[PDB]
Design a protein around this ligand. Structure first.
Ligand SMILES: CN(C)c1ccc(O)c2c1C[C@H]1C[C@H]3[C@H](N(C)C)C(O)=C(C(N)=O)C(=O)[C@@]3(O)C(O)=C1C2=O
Ligand SMILES: CN(C)c1ccc(O)c2c1C[C@H]1C[C@H]3[C@H](N(C)C)C(O)=C(C(N)=O)C(=O)[C@@]3(O)C(O)=C1C2=O
Ligand SMILES: [Cl-]
Ligand SMILES: [Cl-]
Ligand SMILES: [Cl-]
Ligand SMILES: [Cl-]
Ligand SMILES: [Cl-]
Ligand SMILES: [Cl-]
Ligand SMILES: [Cl-]
Ligand SMILES: [Cl-]
Ligand SMILES: [Mg+2]
Ligand SMILES: [Mg+2]
Lengths: 195, 195
């Protein structure tokens, strides 16, 4: 098949949905592409190189709300941004593990920079804006990994689980997301006051 | 060596700190114990069985704040509980991945039940208390995985990272933790009012 970057990644993602991350190997990627292992190696040095690239391509391809709209609030941008991240991470099997393992890369540097600047433009110190972004990010990754990694008992526990299972974990994600955004707001608002 | 449960786990944890989760195999556990693979298999059917057990033993051994103190608030219990979880997950290499992969097990059912009941006793609906517990849990896991899985650029990004690196990610963890607890409080407090 074609072994340009885009084609190698198409096939690696397609494989990831077949095998998950633990089973994704270069050997199996080579078979999928109908090529010998040493041909693939010209293109893809190892699995870590492969994963590094998938993590970025997944976000470039499906993470539509990297940047805020003109006039958008930081409440609404962190909302939309976190929702876009969750969806892009769920679109591929072990998506959040492929994300976790990778390097916030040169090509996304300007995305994350814009975000840190955006947050500083609406009244966050750098410090408190990076904490806001890292918490959203850590909350969203953790919920998505649980959703993905789950792939007689006491009553509350029985009912709680039954309820978590009702939907994908989206209601529990969006609820905690609102708590997190408001917590940030209550902090930002108070300034030097004891809160 | 001894192949009682406690001894098998001691050696598996010791191995996990040597290899991490990806390198932990039953074959290597057998070598570490000085036993043949089929002797180990009598004791430990596979890696998934092994991981299931480590995840639980890690919490039984080092997660000291499963349950709240007499008189403690739900703000302070979720604080202490999340801090105990983070520490227990960091005590072993890829601790959060060993946690993620496992089954909230019969032996911890009563711990998590007590917690769901505790939260309902201080004015949460079951629904809103499970969302509170799952968000703490998802936030803490995600921060711990990032801390663990991280194992020239634009300025804000440069300074932000420099700052994240200053400590282990504990300041960013404890800051987001306070936002999350307050977000919950603002929700719980309002009742039927628009907030
Ligand atoms: C530098 N900054 C404070 C941190 C701290 C800890 C982290 O674990 C991370 C960042 C940058 C953030 C930006 C977040 C952003 N958002 C809050 C989800 C985000 O939208 C993107 C993005 N490329 O669009 C990420 O790279 C991102 O998912 C990400 O992977 C990050 C990340 O992994
Ligand atoms: C049932 N409940 C709402 C959920 C939902 C999603 C989850 O991803 C989980 C739970 C139970 C929670 C309890 C939390 C608790 N805490 C909020 C951190 C906790 O202290 C424990 C514990 N055994 O002490 C967990 O099992 C726990 O870490 C855990 O692993 C959970 C977990 O994985
Ligand atoms: Cl072709
Ligand atoms: Cl080609
Ligand atoms: Cl290309
Ligand atoms: Cl491989
Ligand atoms: Cl002995
Ligand atoms: Cl023995
Ligand atoms: Cl024993
Ligand atoms: Cl194995
Ligand atoms: Mg990331
Ligand atoms: Mg858990």
């Amino acid at each position: 098949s074609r072994l340009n970057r885009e084609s190698v990644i198409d096939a690696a993602l397609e494989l990831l949905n077949e095998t998950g991350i633990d089973g994704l190997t270069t050997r199996k990627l080579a078979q999928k592409l109908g090529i010998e292992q040493p041909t693939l190696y010209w293109h893809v040095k190892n699995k870590r190189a492969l994963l590094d690239a998938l993590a970025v391509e997944i976000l470039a391809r499906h993470h539509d709300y990297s940047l805020p709209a003109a006039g958008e609030s930081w409440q609404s941008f962190l909302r939309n941004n976190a929702m876009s991240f969750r969806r892009a991470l769920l679109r591929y099997r072990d998506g959040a593990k492929v994300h976790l393992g990778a390097r916030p890369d040169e090509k996304q540097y300007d995305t994350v920079e814009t975000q840190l600047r955006f947050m500083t433009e609406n009244g966050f110190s750098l410090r408190d804006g990076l904490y806001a972004i890292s918490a959203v990010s850590h909350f969203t990754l953790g919920a998505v990994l649980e959703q993905q990694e789950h792939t007689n008992l006491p009553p509350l526990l029985r009912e709680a689980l039954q309820i978590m299972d009702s939907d994908d974990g989206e209601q529990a994600f969006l609820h905690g997301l609102e708590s997190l955004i408001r917590g940030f707001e209550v902090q930002l608002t108070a300034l030097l006051q004891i809160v």
